[PDB]
Amino acid sequence: ETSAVQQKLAALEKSSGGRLGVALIDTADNTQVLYRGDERFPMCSTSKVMAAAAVLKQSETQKQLLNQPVEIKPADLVNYNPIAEKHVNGTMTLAELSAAALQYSDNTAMNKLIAQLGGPGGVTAFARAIGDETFRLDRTEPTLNTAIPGDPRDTTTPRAMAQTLRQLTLGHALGETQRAQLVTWLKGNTTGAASIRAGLPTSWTVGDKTGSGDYGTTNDIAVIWPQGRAPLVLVTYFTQPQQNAESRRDVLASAARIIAEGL
Ligand SMILES: *[B]([O])([O])[C]([C][C]([C])[C])[N]C(=O)[C]([C]C1=[C][C]=[C][C]=[C]1)[N]C(=O)C1=[C]N=[C][C]=N1
Ligand SMILES: [Cl-]
């Protein structure tokens, strides 16, 4: 059985030509609205949230960990290094790496977070520790973006990611200083203007993390504070049947516009 919300999302999916996954959690009453909410999708750069959160968790017991400088070598650079390239043969702290990964989607920064956690499996272990049984990170940047249909590597479901994003930002999977820091980072994101944010009222505060990959994969996950109302969490994942498909951030904006009706 479908609601009008799910019917609108299905029509958007049909017009888009791809596969759309949506999960909305309304924290006023803990209700969820799902569309393909238990299907796996490639996370691409939305996985940077889990990596940054895992480092934040380590910092709860190592109080100066975020200020620890990490060396950036020429050989560390990968395909998209807008911040890290300014620090070659220098350093970035774990806080600076987290901010670069989250707010600019820097892939060298993400790889340093993964390395701090002992590899992709360390990010997955953190997910399991906070109750996320679905997330899996298998690869570093940039190979985590291959986004092959049917491949479970580097995937999660919309429901699982929405639940985790809620617990990380509004709940207490992290300590208070750390939860607030993650919110500060997400709110300052620079890459999200055409994605979920473009489908919501400008008066709503949004923290989000985008992602992109092969198969035209176009993703965004967000924590949202509507005016006068309890906050929401929204995941919008989108992937397409052909490898060379173009990005479709407009589909995410359209999904957000649908979800916002009545909220
Ligand atoms: B993330 O893992 O989603 C990451 C963020 C991006 C801004 C650097 N994405 C990528 O590394 C993708 C992978 C990709 C592979 C094949 C097809 C499409 C995408 N890279 C990019 O989107 C990209 C775009 N412009 C410059 C650099 N990188
Ligand atoms: Cl991105």
Residues 201 and 230: beta-carbon distance below 8 Å: no
Residues 55 and 68: beta-carbon distance below 8 Å: no
Residues 91 and 70: beta-carbon distance below 8 Å: yes
175 in contact with ligand 1, CB cutoff 6 A: no
3-class SS at 10? helix
**Which atom, in ligand 1's list, is nearest to the CA of 219?**
3
Residue 258 exposure: Cα atoms within 13 Å on the Cβ side: 25
Q: How far apart, in whole angstroms, are the C-alpha atoms of residue 126 and residue 205?
A: 28
Q: Where are the alpha helices (DSSP H) in the chain?
A: 4-16, 48-59, 94-103, 107-116, 120-129, 158-169, 176-187, 249-260
User: Domain span at residue 118?
Assistant: 4-260
**Which residues are known catalytic residues?**
45
Number of domains in the chain: 1
**CATH number for the domain harbouring residue 40:** 3.40.710.10
Q: How far apart, in whole angstroms, are the C-alpha atoms of residue 1 and residue 98?
A: 41
Q: How was this structure determined?
A: X-ray
Residue 130 exposure: Cα atoms within 13 Å on the Cβ side: 27
Considering only CA atoms, which residue is closest to atom 24 of ligand 1? 80
Q: How far apart, in whole angstroms, are the C-alpha atoms of residue 2 and residue 178?
A: 38
82 in contact with ligand 1, CB cutoff 6 A: no
Angle at 140 between CA 221 and CA 124, to 5 degrees: 65
* Dihedral angle over CA of 133, 129, 163, 149, nearest 10: -40
Ligand nearest to the CA of 221: 2
44 in contact with ligand 1, CB cutoff 6 A: yes
Considering only CA atoms, which residue is closest to atom 16 of ligand 1? 214
> Is 14 exposed, middle or buried, given 0-12, 13-18 or 19+ CB atoms closer than 10 A?
exposed
